Paper text:
[name]-M-15 (cefotaximase-Munich-15) is a class A extended-spectrum β-lactamase (ESBL) capable of hydrolyzing penicillins and cephalosporins, including third- and fourth-generation cephalosporins such as ceftazidime and cefepime, respectively. It is predominantly plasmid mediated, disseminated worldwide, and encountered in diverse Gram-negative pathogens, mostly Enterobacterales, but occasionally also in nonfermenters. [name]-M-15, like other class A SBLs, employs an acylation-deacylation mechanism to hydrolyze β-lactam antibiotics, utilizing four invariant residues: Ser70, Lys73, Ser130, and Glu166. In this study, ultrahigh-resolution X-ray crystal structures and mass spectrometry revealed the mechanism of PAS inhibition of [name]-M-15, an extended-spectrum β-lactamase (ESBL) globally disseminated among Enterobacterales.
To investigate the process of cross-link formation, we obtained structures from cocrystals of enmetazobactam and tazobactam with [name]-M-15E166Q, a conservative mutant in which Glu166 is replaced by an isosteric Gln, such that deacylation of the acylenzyme formed during β-lactam hydrolysis is impaired. Additional diffraction data collected for uncomplexed [name]-M-15E166Q indicate that Asn170 adopts two conformations in the [name]-substituted active site, with the conformation observed in the native enzyme being the minor conformer (occupancy, 0.28). Gln166 in apo-[name]-M-15E166Q adopts the same orientation as Glu166, with other active-site residues also in equivalent positions. Mutation of Glu166 to Gln does not affect backbone or side chain geometry. The catalytic water (Wat; green or blue sphere) moves 0.8 Å due to the movement of Asn170.
Numbering used by the authors: 29 to 287
């Protein structure tokens, strides 16, 4: 029945929907197009921040390292970085800005620090994620052209990797806690997965959006008095200038968590 409901939602939406839910209560999954590729857009900021956190495990004062912000760093969406032009921000501050405001300059500084998109991808491989690929920097990584494998992953792979990062042992205890704290403080996700869950549930999530009306969210969820869940909801549309559809992600979240 969950499968029929997701198929009906996809049909009504007019687009292509990818869902992966991991329920850690019983080690089960709910999957819909979960092995297809989707453009990650800003959901890839989780992997970039995690790569910096991993690097910090052998470089204690890494997160305090200062990074210059210049006019030449500005890209298309810079809500935090635009306030710090001609000063510096720490790597911790850049991580928080990327994860909690979806700041694209912040993402680019995390990418650059670790060596570029191929280094973020190599980190994913080291974790056992052989699907994720980060090809480009901001702002071009969210073009989300149908058929283009650049800057894509699958729902299954991203759910499994997010579980490892937030609930598993990819990161040391301090670094895992820091990632979870950052994601729980996200400001951009209230209309996405969160909108399909009861108000009492606790969520750490990262949204993304891009061309072709691409609208994404990945989340770790602590339901009231239950074992945690991991949920990836990816969505993309046929028209280049399609509008956002955060409501589709909320609907998918409601379908897969009902009962």
């Amino acid at each position: 029945d969950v499968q029929q409901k997701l198929a009906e939602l996809e049909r009504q939406s007019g687009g292509r929907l990818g869902v992966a839910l991991i329920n850690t209560a019983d080690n089960s999954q709910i999957l819909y197009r979960a092995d297809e590729r989707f453009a990650m857009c800003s959901t890839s900021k989780v992997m970039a921040a995690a790569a910096v956190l991993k690097k910090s495990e052998s470089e204690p004062n890494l997160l305090n390292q200062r990074v210059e912000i210049k006019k030449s760093d500005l890209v298309n969406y810079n809500p935090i970085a635009e306030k710090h032009v001609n000063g510096t921000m720490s790597l911790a501050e850049l991580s928080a800005a990327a994860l909690q405001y979806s700041d694209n300059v912040a993402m680019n500084k995390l990418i650059a620090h670790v060596g570029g998109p191929a280094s973020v991808t190599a980190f994913a491989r080291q974790l056992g994620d052989e699907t994720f690929r980060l090809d480009r920097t901001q702002p071009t990584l969210n073009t989300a052209i149908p058929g283009d494998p650049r800057d894509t992953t699958s729902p299954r792979a991203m759910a499994q990797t997010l579980r490892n990062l937030t609930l598993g042992k990819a990161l040391g205890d301090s670094q895992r806690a820091q990632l979870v704290t950052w994601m729980k403080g996200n400001t951009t996700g209230a209309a996405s997965i969160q909108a399909g869950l009861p108000a009492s549930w606790v969520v750490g999530d990262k949204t993304g959006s891009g061309g072709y009306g691409t609208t994404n969210d990945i989340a770790v969820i602590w339901p009231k008095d239950r074992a945690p869940l991991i949920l990836v909801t990816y969505f993309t549309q046929p028209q280049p200038k399609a509008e956002s559809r955060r409501d589709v992600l909320a609907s998918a979240a409601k379908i897969v968590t009902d009962g």
